[PDB]
Amino acid sequence: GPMEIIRSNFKINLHKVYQAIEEADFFAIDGEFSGISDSGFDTPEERYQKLKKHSMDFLLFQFGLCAFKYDHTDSKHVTKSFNFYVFPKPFSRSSPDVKFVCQSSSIDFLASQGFDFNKVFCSGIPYLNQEEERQLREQFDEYTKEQEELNDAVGFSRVIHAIANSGKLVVGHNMLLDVMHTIHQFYCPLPADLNEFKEMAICVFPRLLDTKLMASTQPFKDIINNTSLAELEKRLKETPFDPPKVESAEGFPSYDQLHEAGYDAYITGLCFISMANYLGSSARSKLIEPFFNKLFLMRVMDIPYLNLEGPDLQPKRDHVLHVTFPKEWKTSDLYQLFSAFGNIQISWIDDTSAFVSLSQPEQVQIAVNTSKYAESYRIQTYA
């Protein structure tokens, strides 16, 4: 796989990690979580707040990290990936005792994937957020010993520190949750306001790029019809793309199967490269700039992306409509359908539903009039 970094081998390895971050062009990351949940016309604000009130009690317990460095001689990319198992084992008797939530399906899913929970609960690496640390960098304040038990307590947060400070590009795939959890668990409680969080986000990560958003915009919008990470990996292997040669750095395990955070980062990163290369027809480039710190959005009316530099474009509601259809529909069906009106923007809501936005107010009205003669589906305007 990648490196299996657990509690018992965190310290001896840490430097290998720092080096990889420090020598990398960008890295791609991914999180595995304890669970997803204990929509539609939410303002980003309302989205944020729902995910805050309903997703953040879950534990990010496996963190994937894949560093990519471009070698200019062999025209290839060298990689290094890692699997960090993280677990808030209490430090002391007075140290806070974390209570996280588990979602049965998510657990059962990870079960179906060969995940090893023992590595998380028996061998997970500890960590501390901003407060827990500094509060304790005062307690432990006014021979050499405990100063080095401080570096043990913050434990995994050190690797986050490293990413945050490298000022290099961090790529994820549909990563709004990965980002949310990561600051929640390793920096501090998510703030009351979305504005407040966008600030907070870009100090941990200065440069974010969501592959799923990339795959869902021109020119990719027209050549790709499913943006699942698994399906995206497939589509970017065939023309008019070209999959970059990726080599495992000597002494790391390569891949040659089952989902982990590491693997998925490694894949996400490859996706990013393939889509960058196509765009030039580089990995720090100006071509990719417009994608920086715009996070992907799910199940939403007219927001194309979450802006992290803020604030977000208005919906322009009089452009949208809600459709319900046989589950047997695939994206091409939705396009071909509304093809009368030209390019459209899709946003899957269900397995049997999706939001569409049309080019003009007059158009919405019309597709509704047409649908009066169909059975397969139904069109809406205001719920």
Ligand X SMILES: CN1CN([C@@H]2O[C@H](COP(=O)(O)O)[C@@H](O)[C@H]2O)c2nc(N)[nH]c(=O)c21
Ligand Y SMILES: Nc1nc2c(ncn2[C@@H]2O[C@H](COP(=O)(O)OP(=O)(O)O)[C@@H](O)[C@H]2O)c(=O)[nH]1
Annotated binding site for a divalent metal cation: 30, 32, 178, 264
Return the number of the residue (350 or 362) whose C-beta is nearest ligand Y.
350
Rule CB under 6 A: is residue 229 a binding residue for ligand Y?
A: yes
Strands 246-248 and 76-85: parallel
Rule CB under 6 A: is residue 228 a binding residue for ligand Y?
A: yes
DSSP secondary structure string for all residues of 143-187: --STHHHHHHHSBTHHHHHHHHHH--EEEESS-HHHHHHHHHHHT
Q: DSSP 3-state assignment of 57?
A: coil
Rule CB under 6 A: is residue 351 a binding residue for ligand X?
A: yes
**Count of beta carbons in the 10 Å neighbourhood of residue 172:** 29
Binding to its own copies in span 37-96, by CB under 8 A:
38, 59, 87-90
Return the number of the residue (40 or 206) whose C-beta is nearest ligand Y.
40
Binding to ligand Y in span 275-304, by CB under 6 A:
296, 298
CA separation for the pair 296, 353 (Å, rounded): 19
Span from 10-18, 113-121, 145-153, 202-210 in contact with its own copies (CB under 8 A): 113-121
CA distances from 319 to 46, 340, 360 (A): 21, 15, 6
Return the number of the residue (149 or 222) whose C-beta is nearest its own copies.
149
Residue 177 near which of ligand X, ligand Y, its own copies, none (CB within 5-8 Å, type-dependent)? ligand Y
Kindly state the smallest distance separating residue 327's Cβ from its own copies, in Å. 12
Rule CB under 6 A: is residue 36 a binding residue for ligand Y?
A: yes
Binding to ligand X in span 177-236, by CB under 6 A:
226-228
CA separation for the pair 126, 142 (Å, rounded): 25
Rg of the chain (C-alpha set) = 22
Size (the chain), residues: 383
CA separation for the pair 29, 82 (Å, rounded): 10
Rule CB under 6 A: is residue 81 a binding residue for ligand Y?
A: no
Q: What's phi and psi for 139, nearest 5 deg?
A: -50, -70
Among 8, 19, 118, 370, binds its own copies (CB under 8 A): 118
Residue 350 near which of its own copies, ligand Y, ligand X, none (CB within 5-8 Å, type-dependent)? ligand X
Token pair for 14: 């840490």
**Count of beta carbons in the 10 Å neighbourhood of residue 65:** 28
**349 Cβ contact partners less than 8 Å away, ≥ 6 residues apart:** 39, 40, 299, 322, 355
CA atoms within 13 Å, Cβ hemisphere of 109: 12
Binding to ligand Y in span 237-256, by CB under 6 A:
none
Rule CB under 8 A: is residue 107 a binding residue for its own copies?
A: yes
Among 21, 163, 177, 300, binds ligand Y (CB under 6 A): 177
Among 116, 133, 199, 333, binds its own copies (CB under 8 A): 116
| Residue 112 DSSP symbol | T
Span from 122-130, 194-202, 307-315, 327-335 in contact with ligand X (CB under 6 A): 327-335
Residue 145 near which of ligand Y, ligand X, its own copies, none (CB within 5-8 Å, type-dependent)? none
Please give the residue ranges that form the binding site for ligand Y (CB under 6 A).
Answer: 36, 93, 173-174, 176-177, 212, 227-229, 296, 298, 327, 330, 351
